[PDB]
Subunit: 391 residues, 5 copies
């Protein structure tokens, strides 16, 4: 006698004519209204200039083909019908490496005022620019864009639906102890035109994502502590001995092994320059210049050299002080010959005493240069931490 | 004359109207009833904060559009019809990296009471948090979530169908000799609301998965045995010789090679800190401080140094004791000169005898410090094993 | 006037009603009949506890909806119709990492007796347990399983169709010079029941796959030949010199480099323990205990030590024998002083002669221990080869 | 009373007959008109001779089945209908490794003049040849091709639609601070015929893509600065000592480690030869020839050798100058014997004085050879930079 | 008045009955006619015994359901209709790892004689055997196979359509400067039968693909040049000194590092044996036997040894020659004692003179053995190059 409410859906799906743009008047544009929220962001591999994310997407647009009345229809204000039989526009992410593995979920809402609602989960992995000027503290600024690809500015209207102050702080839905944390987003409207008389719609979502170097600080500052340890063990030894040389070549090789461990654990891109690794290579360069000085001291303690201290080295010293600062006859003859050979034997020692005073001064000079270099890098690190603390 | 039972399926599929929400009364919510079991869990790559699993999923929901009578229908209580022609809700896993490669299997059950049954195998690889505070013994706690994505709390009711005590212990179906073993799961009901007047359903499955370090114990405790072997071979040698130095630099390089073998075989994440590797780096730091002490002993056995034992080293010693604890004339002249040169020749030996007593005491002091460090780490390892044995 | 035979297919496809379970009587179960053959097996990556294969699958089941008569139909006993319009059950592989990239091939056979035939190529990559107790000779036992996922034991009957003796030896179709070779398979029937009054069908295919170590034998036995070469070059040298020490530290580092080359070329899993690498680490442990003995001999040739040979070393020796086994006065005074200093100069040599006899005996003792260890490992390797030759 | 404009779409979709080639006259070919723009190019992995890109594609073709009149149709000049119901040709990229993950976007334009418009985003990863003759400055020339795969030259006409001067410079739409930058493209028309009487259409897009070595210059020129540093520290030392040998073997090993760091960070292909790495291997070859010379000098300072300076070394020197350039008797006897033994003791020194003058000249000769080699490589590098600056 | 030609396609698609095997008489088999061409072959990763290719595929088969007349149909001899509405057989590649990412392109040709034409691009990555007996020159022989998977030998006839002499040389369509080049292909027909009374069709395409080692020759022959350089620097040094030992241990470690660089840049499979790397390991084995000889010479220059030259070493020498080839009394007493101690002091030198003549001869003997080994390997390399030049 009395059928169910499903015939009402037949009255919702009698003569719909799917495929046509749903408007009463054609020059009046239809209005879609969109919103986005970020549940949890996945990892950033960052080698391919790429980033991954997984967001929840809300939209609704006025369909105007469907009228419902509250009377005699058993008060079904909200009801779900499949999206494969109704109209849907094309809102797409751009600059993407591939489309995310998203489900279909064919259900959308219909109501009395005609508009159709849609919720969808979608993930996107896309190419975007990141700054690696400072490695442990990264800005990681990016921008996503949505557009009506096949429709124009008088075809589909873009509505953000929400006041930007509560868009600015959306931290109620976020996963704990993640590596990357978000601080604020910024919605704004633009337009891009390729040629004349063709203007298409564009919506953009500005994103600031931030990671803290809680793991990188302990694992990266302690190699600098090891640098200070090898610097202060390169301090108390006399420069004239070769034992510091035989230690420091193995120390340079072990330092290169430990730093290539750190740098292949964390490699960088071909676009940006990590200045921490650049300063590590500068330390390796200053250490091999120090090793050139070291083998100069190794050659300096030899007996045979032709070097000039009078014409120009005195000028360098003055410039430093100005800017920077019968058988008894045979018996006596043979014993005097023994005395002469013994005198030659301890005559060996006087040849190396003149050399030892010069190279120690030049070693202390280049040690002061390296100390000012380490102090300037410490000022640079404190300044970078203060700039990041300014935020 | 008499057709087959397939016309009965025509009576089951005459006027179904697929796509409408099947209810008699609209404000009365439909009830789905769900259950999950885990046949075998796949490997966890754990670098991407991700885990893989493969589970079997059971659900059934009251359709109410289909009535069957036991009389005159040849007693077909249970029969299979394809799922592409009937209604199905949307129950989805969240925080997933991609949807699993699952089959379609278009067959579902219909009965006399109206409800439709569904069995499906599904695998999911999803992002989840893991704790790497202690590397060989891992808690590996996680949580999965199912929800009605497009339906609300008065739309679809979630039913767990099974008493939680027999949910707590489900070990009848599990694969032997796997790396990861499960102990218990915990079903519970929650609700999340983003804004006002919008409350959606949520079901959560708590999972404890556990691996035993049967391979990691033998392969990780034996490097500590090698650490004790190199510690006790660093004990019996006299500190004044350079042979311990020339061995210990090669020993430190070989120890670094063997430990980078262990650590690139098992790397960690950028979020958590493996304290075993941290203690290995602490041992490398104490060994290079020991090497700084070692080259201090190498410089200590030289003849030329200006060090003060009287003003402050005696204060350090007191502080340690308080807190821690004619031709014959020419012949005689020349032979006396030979005696004088020979006296100088064995006068060389007395200059190095004063140094040798001090550095041995400081070496034994820092050896006691390292022994207390190894003993404290042994207490820490036994305490961690006891905490894991508490479970 | 006379149409073609395609109208016969219309008589085969007039009122089929796809989607219903095809039976005359419902409690009588339909019978599927299945068979499998393996054309070529792909590689096993074996790190993820996973294996890949590509097999050919034959099945046929009685449809009973389709009757053909040999009279007046131009003798079409066998004809092909698409499988998208007819019924098909669900026979699935389990414990799979993902479904194989298989084609569709929509053609199946129909005949006079009603049953429908199906041939399909399908590949599967699935998780399965492998034994790595012995690395070059692997058993590689596994089991695959097929089931009716949505049907019960009174719904679909499983038929193997072939006598198990000719299932046991199927080597006519196999690719030559592959790494993995199969020997026999074993078909058997089981049943698994999760809860009461619910019993589902199960078919299992037992598989023995085997690889020969023709590459691993030459590349793995020759490092043991190098171990015997370094053992016999560690034999003829006197232990008192440091030249064997300075060679053996570089030999241990080069041996570690060559063995990490072998072991990162062939790594193992986190579940099983490769005992060949375990014995390699045992050889490294015995070599560093030998190196501790070696530096004990290095300290043994020094002049200053306080060791006790009388109280306990004699007890150790007895235990080894029991279980294991005027101016002329000034001239004469000064020349006698020269004689005294020269007597002291060759008095240096007598202090080191007492030490040299003890450590050679202990070195030969630990060399006998290492020789018995290598001989026991040779017995173990011959025993393992004999156990594999037993098959 | 008055229906909407959707019935007009019914008048657009009444008797379309999708699947037929839309022409009035068959021998008159239909005309497609195409254009391409490059929004942002992705990274080039370049190991697989492959490159990735993401472009925007515009096309339109005359359909001629659809007539619209401006009168009485409410002025709908442009309207969107789905592309799944209308005709579309096959324009495909060739030599592709796989098809890009592109969306469907089922909407195309229809107008009064009959032609249908289509916009699509598509990415393609394809095999193409690149030149690695010079590593930091790469030409990276390539060519893409579009064709009508199933249609012939009298079937589909290809139209580029745009004047080639404004095709030549299209830099208004390009992403900033990318690694690869484009300069110009070149459109042209060709034709390929496999056999006789079969000629098919072809369109080709020539692409010049360019990367700047802003990261590679600083990271690659500074190893050459290190090469000059080790060259000038190999200058001031005397060749006769072994300290330069013991440094230079460790210097060669450290140089090989640093260069294998650079070369496994940036590897090359199996097709092209990177001449910078070739010159690095040439420097390693000249350094091991220098090391052979070095150990020749090491053997040169020994006392026992049989070498001929008279017959042929004088000829080599002339060729170099021409082209390149009672008891007292017992007392006296025994003291004369002491004099004879002391004379033998300082007779040791005269044997090594003759050798030292020759090898220094040959060392300076090969140092001049290496200096001319480094100077020629500097000329080569400046010439290559000038050729790239010519562009 | 006069409709278009699309109604003709309706006359082509009125009563087609898709899904039936199209024949007039059933026992007369339908004939497909196929051809293949290779545009460009992709890279071969060769670790997984796998190869990739991308080919163009041409086929046509007689449909016989469609008749066209040249009269009154406006001369449409060739026209395109979609392939989703017409019959298509199943021609598949076998032994494939996965199906290639191929497009759909739903357009096929129909004509007056009834047959339907099809062109398709398809790529396939498949498992196939390769020979690595000689590494730089590879045969790389393979075979592909096509078959009618679901049809028998009286169902579908295979036609190659082209004379085999012009199949033998098809080099008009091939990409320049690729790594792999093809020389000839060989078409032939076979048949495989699993059981009795079941014989299915098979077509096979034999492929010879060839790569030239233009990069491998320069990068692989120059390590052999380095082997000759280290061999000739191991020639001029005297064997009695330890300086050759201290160089050659570092030379062996550096040679192992350089060769593991070459061998992890180019690794091999677990099936085949690369004899170049085998000869490299043989050179390492002969060098460590040479190092055992070297440390035998190191022990040979010591003063304390008990070796027998008389009983058996003379027999070895004969076998080599046969097959291979008052106070004055106190003064005189004390000065004679000084003479005796001085006589003992230069009595040290005579003990080491007897040893030095033997080990040089044995060193030259093993050097001749290594020279014959290098000469035999040179003969082997020239012979392998001549065998490859025979082709
Ligand atoms: C299809 O082609 C045939 C072959 O040319 C056409 O037959 C001839 O067409 C010419 C062109 O006008 C006439 O002059 C001849 O008289 C035709 N032959 C005969 C026997 O009448 C045929 O007309 C073409 N079909 C159509 C529709 O034009
Ligand atoms: N799981 C319920 C879906 C859901 C809840 N809140 C949401 C907010 C936005 C969105 O796209 C989706 C949602
Ligand atoms: N072959 C059917 C497997 C099976 C048996 N019982 C089950 C229960 C739930 C489920 O998802 C699956 C199953
Ligand atoms: N994003 C809107 C589509 C669009 C704008 N400009 C374009 C240029 C070319 C093209 O294929 C497409 C477009
Ligand atoms: N543009 C069509 C390419 C093409 C030309 N001739 C061909 C022959 C065979 C084939 O598969 C493809 C082709
Ligand atoms: N070309 C058909 C291959 C084939 C021959 N015999 C078979 C038997 C079973 C099977 O799945 C496949 C086959």
């Amino acid at each position: 006698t009395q059928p169910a409410l499903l015939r009402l859906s037949d009255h919702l799906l009698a003569n719909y004519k799917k495929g046509v743009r749903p408007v009463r008047d054609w020059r009046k544009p239809t209005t879609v209204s969109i919103d986005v929220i970020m549940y949890a962001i996945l990892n950033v591999d960052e080698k391919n200039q790429v980033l991954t994310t997984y967001i929840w997407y809300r939209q609704y647009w006025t369909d105007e083909f469907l009228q419902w009345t509250p009377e005699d229809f058993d008060n079904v204000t909200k009801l779900s019908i499949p999206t494969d039989s109704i109209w849907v526009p094309d809102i797409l992410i751009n600059e993407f490496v591939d489309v995310g593995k998203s489900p279909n979920i064919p259900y959308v809402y219909v109501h009395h005022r005609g508009e159709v609602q849609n919720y969808k989960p979608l993930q996107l992995v896309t190419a975007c620019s990141l700054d690696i000027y400072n490695f442990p503290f990264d800005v990681q600024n990016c921008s996503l864009t949505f557009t009506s690809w096949l429709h124009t500015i008088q075809d589909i209207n873009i509505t953000l639906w929400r006041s930007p102050e509560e868009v600015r702080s959306d931290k109620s839905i976020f996963i704990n102890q993640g590596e990357w944390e978000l601080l604020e987003v910024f919605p704004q409207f633009k337009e891009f035109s390729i040629d004349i008389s063709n203007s298409y719609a564009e919506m953009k979502f500005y994103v600031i994502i931030r990671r803290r170097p809680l793991f990188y600080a302990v694992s990266l500052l302690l190699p600098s502590i090891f640098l200070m340890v090898v610097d202060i063990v390169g301090f108390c030894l006399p420069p004239d001995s070769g034992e510091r040389v035989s230690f420091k070549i193995t120390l340079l090789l072990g330092y290169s092994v430990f730093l290539i461990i750190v740098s292949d654990t964390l490699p960088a891109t071909a676009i940006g320059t990590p200045l921490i690794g650049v300063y590590f290579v500068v330390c390796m360069a200053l250490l091999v210049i120090s090793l050139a000085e070291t083998i100069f001291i190794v050659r300096l303690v030899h007996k045979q050299d032709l070097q000039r201290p009078v014409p120009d080295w005195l000028r360098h010293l003055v410039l430093d002080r100005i800017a920077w600062i019968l058988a008894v006859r045979g018996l006596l003859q043979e014993l005097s010959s023994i005395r002469h050979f013994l005198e030659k034997r301890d005559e060996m020692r006087e040849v190396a005493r003149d050399w030892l005073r010069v190279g120690y001064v030049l070693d202390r000079l280049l040690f002061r240069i390296y100390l000012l270099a380490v102090l300037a890098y410490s000022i640079t690190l404190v300044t970078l931490w203060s700039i990041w603390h300014y935020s």
